[PDB]
């Protein structure tokens, strides 16, 4: 378990600075919800260890509040419109005479796709690829070590 | 009688070679004789690296 506070997450996000906009509840709510998707157990042989998992958590956090606050604000005519708005990634943008065009994330899958959705997830998916590197090796026993080798090495 | 020792130091005391009997090995020429303390050419130095070598692959 990690315990959350709002310091931390207040000065890490300064859009989420107003108490009276995003109640101390409502933080931690996301926080415990979060939890799933990022088991908070800390380990020293996680990839995802320490400071670095404690800052995953955090960034899907602002990921899940700003989808909340995207709901609750709308807008579509003073108000929460049927359906709700989605997400995901803004590929291609027009407003006035003013166009923009960016680079499509490369989304093989959903949670990657829901998390190129916000900046926050996609701080969080750029962390986990980046901490991705190699893999595991689960079972296997030290076969070698009974077996002579060159130089008197682990005879 | 040449490059053949006529003593052996052993412990102080130098004992002549009709003394006693020596056998060595395959008696290598004489220009590097005094280089195998004028003995022979070990059998050990022959098979060192065949030996590794046959046990490693064994390995």
Redesign the interface.
């Known amino acids: 378990m990690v315990i959350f506070d709002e310091h931390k997450f207040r000065t890490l996000f300064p859009e989420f600075a107003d108490p009276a906009a995003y109640p101390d509840v409502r933080l931690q709510m996301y926080f415990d919800i979060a939890c799933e998707f990022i088991s908070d157990r800390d380990s020293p042989y996680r990839i995802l260890n320490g400071k670095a998992l404690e800052a995953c958590l955090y960034l899907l956090t602002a990921h899940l509040l700003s989808l909340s606050t995207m709901q609750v604000q709308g807008a579509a005519g003073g108000g929460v419109t049927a359906g709700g708005t989605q997400g995901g990634f803004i590929t291609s943008a027009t407003v006035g005479e003013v166009s923009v065009a960016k680079l499509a994330p490369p989304a093989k899958n959903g949670w990657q796709w829901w998390l190129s959705g916000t900046p926050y997830g996609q701080e969080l998916w750029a962390l986990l690829s980046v901490k991705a590197v190699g893999g595991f090796y689960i079972g296997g026993l030290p076969e070698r070590r009974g077996?002579?080798?060159?130089g008197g090495t682990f005879w | 009688h040449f490059y053949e020792p006529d003593f052996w130091i052993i412990s102080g005391k130098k004992y002549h070679r009709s003394h006693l009997v020596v056998v060595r090995g395959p008696q290598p020429p004489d220009i590097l004789k005094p280089t195998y303390i004028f003995g022979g050419i070990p059998l050990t130095q022959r098979i060192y690296e065949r030996v590794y070598a046959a046990e490693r692959t064994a390995n």
């Open positions: 077996f002579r080798k060159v």
